């Protein structure tokens, strides 16, 4: 089931964003989502990630780093540009 | 029952932290403190004189001095380095 071991990743910036969130290392996955085709869809996705790990959090620091992801704020701060610059392509960009 | 009187202290800066924090001097206590083996402990002992001498004192300015010793502030903040550093060392330190 797993793909050519040699094969490079249809979509890598993608693939190196999950990874660096899985792990919280939240500075690497900040570039890693600067650099993605799709920026909202990945913040998003890195807020629903990291609110998800919060409570699996054993250390107090950890957790806490991960309550304070701001990736949400990513997410709503591009499409506050988003919005300003067409307000019409922005309804299709989230539909 | 007085040691010897050239025997040199086992806990120098416990003792001149202590001797400092007797007479409100509280820049030297917070160099002593900063030298001092055990800080939490220290921190809170001096707060506790602190709190103690504020009834006594006379002087309305020394009074409002002691009121702001901030030595409970110390504990904290040093307590805090170490819970974010450790969270399991800090509690056989608490205990």
Chains 1, 2 share one sequence.
Not at 39 to 66: D, F, P, Q
Request: aromatic letters at 12%.
């Amino acid at each position: 089931n797993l793909p050519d071991m040699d094969r490079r990743c249809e979509h890598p910036w993608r693939d190196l964003f999950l990874w660096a969130i899985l792990q919280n290392r939240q500075e690497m996955a900040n570039y890693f989502w600067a650099m993605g085709p799709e920026a909202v869809a990945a913040a998003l996705v890195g807020c629903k990630i990291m609110k998800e790990m919060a409570h699996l959090a054993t250390e107090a620091e950890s957790a806490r780093s991960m309550k304070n992801a701001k990736y949400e704020q990513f997410a709503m701060d591009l499409f506050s540009e988003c919005y300003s610059n067409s307000e019409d392509r922005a309804y299709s960009l989230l539909v």
